[PDB]
Write a protein that binds this ligand. Structure first.
Ligand SMILES: [Mg+2]
Ligand SMILES: [Mg+2]
Length: 728
């Protein structure tokens, strides 16, 4: 028997037993909501909103088909932008710009509304990653520098396995230069400090020449830990972000330092998105329970994992808040943890963890809203040892929405969930991903549809490129994947998001955010390049790891984002006509070598990701590209690569035999790259029977058939196929 799920009858619903029991025995106790109340309300929401959800998806399909037909009816003609835009308007794709308004969201935590800094995104299915992300609010700058390529190993500065002082002295010097910039002394350089102490309410820095100095701006000093005359830490603030100079002259690093400094502790990942979507693989009730159970551990504060470090073992847990003494004897407490959002899945998928009264699968987005909000009640009512929101809000990221009617449906869904759970109206806040064309070109109206719930807008630029390719699939051959960043549309898309965010009053109430740095080991490059995100007026942007959060925090000390937003609020707004410029290749006269490099690079990226998704249920993998650069891959990069190959195939840039040959060749490369993993099974040489290879092949050769180019229908089907065959 194929795909087996044991269910029980719950009113008119059929609920997977594993999920029923998880909700009743783990999520519900401590919320003050009875299981009967919850399940009866859930069934009402499902029965009312599932038909609306289905009609929204039918509308996507209808519009894509009309666009397909529009280009087909104009095969071989030069693109007529004016006729295209009248068509998009007449069919209801491009809607009138929304009337002016200001967002009304209230009760937003400071990390979102009033601060600028990094935002970490991690798969919530991995409890170790989730724990580290919760704790990444504070990060060791010395560890981030010593451990990454920010500091070159040249000149005998190798990391090695111990503490290489040659390297460590470079780390220390980099950090002193940061201190000179972010907390300048009135005289001299932190490089010459011999002592940090507190006297008469001010930081006093003794220098090697025997004099003492204060800070140039003495108000940057806030508080300390330990004795004022010999503090263990001094707490500073700059651009709204905190950092500690940590002092211990008996520590291995401290005893090499004239002032005993052992580290600089940076306030780093202000917020974290615990992901249930593009970075996880969860295809059935068993997988979804694991997801929900980790979110539950975060919301109750008891998420914990045993880890082997040193020779022994200890239990990793969520860190407490941090306590400091002010010079007047009062106590100052800082949040010890990143403020958590949860990313629900979007409107597309259904799953068979719940069947409705007609035996149909229930939309997964509706389920996530019910279950993740139920679980968040543990935070809202204080049934937790680790508070998340201090304002009575839950922060849900809603991805992959197309246009303002779909934003209104999320607003409606969240209100219905609140009613089921007895939550005050607008408790459930929404982070709106701007990552689909129909949202971009209607963005102001999309925000307006959730104007009292909005807590962010963010340019998921990789999904957005995937939608760009699928939407104009029939128009012609698109440019190479690496050429997209220079096309007209994408710069206008990024600027539009900031312009609309500022014009709709998000400042002071929500984040205007930007995308993920996807090269986890190229931290020197990240430090060079990602300053562009705060310079663009985004008060947050995505990083892949706690280390990258610590390093990206340095950018917010170089750029005052809110002041930058004031400047950018004056510029001419981005043009929808630029956004409507389809990234078609001027001609298809690429060198045969150029074509081979594009096909091979996409084929490797697809296969390196898909094999781990299908065989191991891993939704986020680092995959070397054909230059051996390690790329962080999730479903959004798979969407781009599969859709580009489908597009080149559809327009005869490449042949099917060609794409198949490249996939087989790059599969062998992928197998080699994974050969040292004992849990890895190769794809070659039996490609016909290999589920993962067939999944990759389907996404490419049938890329034109996937709804808006989404990869989940194939991945979910094939992962379940693999799980069933192997007893997983
Ligand atoms: Mg905290
Ligand atoms: Mg997304």
């Amino acid at each position: 028997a194929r795909f087996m799920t044991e269910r029980v009858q719950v009113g008119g619903l059929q609920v997977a037993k594993v999920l029923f029991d998880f909700v009743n025995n783990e999520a519900i106790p401590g919320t003050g909501v009875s299981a009967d109340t919850f399940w009866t309300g859930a069934e009402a929401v499902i029965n009312d909103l599932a038909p609306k959800n289905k009609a929204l998806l039918a509308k996507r399909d209808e519009l894509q088909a009309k666009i397909d037909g529009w280009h087909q009816a104009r095969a071989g003609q030069a693109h007529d932008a004016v006729a295209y835009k009248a068509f998009l308007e007449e069919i209801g794709y491009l809607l009138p710009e929304a009337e002016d308004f200001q967002a009304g969201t209230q009760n937003v935590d400071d990390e979102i509304a009033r601060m600028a800094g990094p935002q970490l995104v991690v798969p919530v299915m991995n409890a170790r990653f989730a724990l580290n992300a919760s704790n990444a609010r504070w990060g060791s700058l010395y560890d981030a520098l010593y451990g990454t390529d920010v500091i070159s190993e040249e000149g005998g500065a190798e990391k090695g396995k111990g503490y290489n002082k040659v390297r460590g002295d470079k780390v220390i010097a980099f950090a002193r230069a940061f201190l000179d910039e972010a907390a300048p002394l009135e005289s001299g350089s932190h490089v010459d400090a011999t002592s940090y102490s507190v006297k008469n309410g001010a930081l006093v820095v003794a220098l090697k020449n025997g004099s003492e100095t204060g800070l140039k701006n003495a108000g940057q000093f806030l508080a300390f830990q330990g004795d004022a005359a010999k503090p263990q830490a001094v707490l500073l603030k700059h651009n709204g972000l905190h950092f500690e100079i940590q002092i211990d002259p008996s520590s291995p690093v401290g005893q090499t330092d004239a002032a005993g400094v052992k580290d600089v502790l940076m306030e780093a990942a202000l917020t974290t998105i615990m992901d249930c979507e593009d970075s996880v693989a969860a295809v059935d009730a068993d997988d979804k329970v694991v997801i929900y159970r980790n979110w539950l551990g975060l919301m109750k504060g008891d998420l914990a994992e045993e880890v082997s470090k040193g020779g022994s073992t200890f239990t990793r847990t969520m860190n407490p808040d941090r306590v400091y003494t002010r010079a007047d004897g009062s106590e100052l407490t800082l949040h010890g943890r990143s403020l958590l959002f949860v990313r629900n899945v979007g409107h597309l998928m259904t799953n068979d963890a719940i069947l409705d009264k007609d035996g149909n699968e229930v939309p997964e987005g509706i389920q996530d809203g019910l279950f993740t909000s139920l679980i968040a009640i543990h935070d809202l009512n204080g049934n937790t040892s680790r508070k998340n929101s201090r304002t009575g809000s839950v922060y849900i990221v809603k991805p992959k929405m197309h246009g303002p009617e779909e934003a209104a449906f999320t607003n409606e869904l969240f209100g219905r969930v609140e009613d089921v759970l007895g939550l005050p109206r607008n408790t459930l806040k929404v982070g709106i991903m701007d990552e689909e064309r129909r949202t971009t070109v209607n963005l102001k109206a999309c925000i307006k549809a959730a104007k009292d719930r909005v807590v962010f807008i963010n340019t998921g630029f990789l999904d957005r490129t995937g939608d760009e390719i699928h939407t104009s699939m029939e128009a012609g051959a698109v440019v190479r994947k690496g050429a997209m960043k220079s096309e007209k549309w994408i710069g206008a898309y990024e600027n539009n998001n900031v312009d609309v965010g500022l014009a709709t009053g998000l400042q002071g109430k929500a984040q205007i955010g930007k995308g993920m740095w996807a090269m986890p080991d190229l931290m020197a490059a990240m430090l060079e390049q990602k300053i562009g995100h705060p310079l663009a007026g985004a008060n947050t942007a995505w990083v892949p790891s706690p280390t990258a959060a610590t390093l990206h925090a340095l950018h917010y000390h170089k750029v005052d984002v809110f002041a930058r937003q004031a400047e950018l609020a004056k510029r001419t707004p981005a043009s929808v006509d630029d956004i409507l410029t389809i990234p078609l290749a001027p001609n298809t006269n690429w060198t045969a070598e150029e074509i081979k490099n594009e096909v091979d690079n996409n084929a490797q990226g697809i296969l390196g990701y898909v094999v781990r998704w299908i065989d191991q249920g891993v939704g986020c993998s680092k995959v070397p590209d054909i230059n051996d650069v390690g790329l962080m891959e999730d479903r959004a990069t798979l969407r781009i690569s599969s859709q580009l190959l489908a597009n080149w195939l559809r327009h005869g840039v490449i042949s099917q035999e060609q794409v198949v040959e490249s996939l087989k060749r790059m599969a062998v490369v992928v197998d080699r790259q994974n050969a040292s993993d004992p849990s890895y099974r190769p794809m070659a040489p039996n490609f016909d029977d290999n589920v993962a290879f067939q999944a990759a092949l389907e996404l490419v050769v049938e890329g034109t058939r996937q709804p808006n180019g989404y990869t989940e229908p194939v991945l979910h089907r094939r992962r379940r196929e693999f799980k069933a065959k192997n007893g997983l």
